Design a protein around this motif. Structure first.
Motif: not given
Lengths: 386, 22
Positions: A329, A333, B10
């Motif tokens: 990531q 994130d 996200r």
């Protein structure tokens, strides 16, 4: 004084309402479906019934849910609701009088009209809703089609054998697990007694579940922090086949993976979900972290073998995808959580008491909370579809 | 592409943050 507590709660409630306002505004992008419905009383249980009915020519289908009630003090019922779901409104259809709040209600797979319930008492009731009126008697007198004994106290855990029709397991705050075989129906015995009692745990037994393939195996979890695996063929009922130090706190739930006969999950007061391989229980496969408080329910997806969900006290329901474990990531994130954390459902503003994945519409979930809210929802398809 | 799948994924993990429509 005590005042600091009621003030601190009210400040918390204020943050919770702000976050809710933000989530609500976000829903068009996160969800292909969100239905919110306020029940008369909170439900402590939810489970989708296996049946769906799809009317010809119509743009929706009808599904149904086993719920219950939890009155401050008033008459309690066991509930069957219908839900209309868009295709490729929620209405109470049946109410049955019930002795106290329904802690948990589960249908028998081999006969979905049969429903077991757990109560504030030591009794484990059994009802057959086809043998009852839709409209409950105004007296409020609970007449159960069976009544199972064996426990000295209430509990939550409740699980029908999907391979041996009528074999019912149950967990209690008395530290025991009882088994019944209600297949041995009498003409009208109307009270049964427990075929076996398992006493391996040294604390409140929070949950029990049959294995889905092997009719002899079941798992239980308890406030002694242990996961135990039981074989009904062994003659020793004080010592499980396997006993694992599963978590650093109380263990409130387990769920067996429906595609992988060796894989299960447990959820804890330690704020984690643990992944297990029954072939080597000495070693946890993975620990899923993100929850902020105690976890009370964990359920595998009935459609997607790598997908798991968990709920609890932190008001959040998380959905996890195992296949993302170990992926890399960005730092932005990683701030949000581990790569296997796929979705956080923020729709609720109180403790989530139970949830159920719809077995006929992939990705649809029903979740119920302590403030009466029931939500039926489905995350946006691009979230998972890539 | 007011909102990408990537920003949607996200946002899936930040439900209490307003979604940024850029």
């Amino acid at each position: 004084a005590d005042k600091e507590a009621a003030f601190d709660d009210a400040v918390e409630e204020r943050v919770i309402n702000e976050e809710y306002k933000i989530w609500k505004k976000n829903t068009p992008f996160l969800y292909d479906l969100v239905m919110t419905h306020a029940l008369e009383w909170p439900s402590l249980t939810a489970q989708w019934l296996p049946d769906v009915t799809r009317p010809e020519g119509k743009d929706f289908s009808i599904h149904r849910l086993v719920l219950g009630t939890h009155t401050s003090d008033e008459q309690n019922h066991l509930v069957i609701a219908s839900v209309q779901l868009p295709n490729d409104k929620i209405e109470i259809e049946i109410k049955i009088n019930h002795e106290g709040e329904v802690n948990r209600a589960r249908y028998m797979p081999q006969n979905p009209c049969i429903i077991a319930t757990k109560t504030p008492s030591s009794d484990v009731l059994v009802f057959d809703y086809t043998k009852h009126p839709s409209k409950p008697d105004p007296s409020g007198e609970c007449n159960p089609d069976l009544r199972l004994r064996g426990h000295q106290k209430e509990g939550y855990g409740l699980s029908w054998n999907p391979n041996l029709s009528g074999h019912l397991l149950s967990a209690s705050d008395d530290h025991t697990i009882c088994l019944w075989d209600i297949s041995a129906v009498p003409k009208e015995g109307k009270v049964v007694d427990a075929k076996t009692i398992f006493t391996g745990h040294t604390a409140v037994v929070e949950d029990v579940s049959w294995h889905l393939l092997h009719e002899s195996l079941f798992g239980s979890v308890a406030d002694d922090q242990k996961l135990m695996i039981w074989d009904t063929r062994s003659n020793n009922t004080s010592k499980p086949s396997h006993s694992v130090d599963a978590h650093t706190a109380e263990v409130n739930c387990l769920s067996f993976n429906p595609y992988s006969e060796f894989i299960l999950a447990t959820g804890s007061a330690d704020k984690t979900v643990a992944l297990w391989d029954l072939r080597n229980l000495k070693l946890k496969l993975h620990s899923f972290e993100s929850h902020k408080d105690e976890i009370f329910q964990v359920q595998w997806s009935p459609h997607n073998e790598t997908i798991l969900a968990s709920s609890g006290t932190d008001r959040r329901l998380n959905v996890w995808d195992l296949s993302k474990i170990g992926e890399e990531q960005s730092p932005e994130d990683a701030e949000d959580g581990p790569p296997e954390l796929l979705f956080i459902h923020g729709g609720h503003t109180a403790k989530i008491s139970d949830f159920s994945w719809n077995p006929n519409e992939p990705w649809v979930i029903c979740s119920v909370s302590e403030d009466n809210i029931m939500q039926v929802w489905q995350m946006a398809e691009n979230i998972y579809n890539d | 592409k007011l909102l990408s799948s990537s920003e949607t994924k996200r946002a899936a993990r930040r439900p209490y943050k307003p979604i940024a429509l850029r």
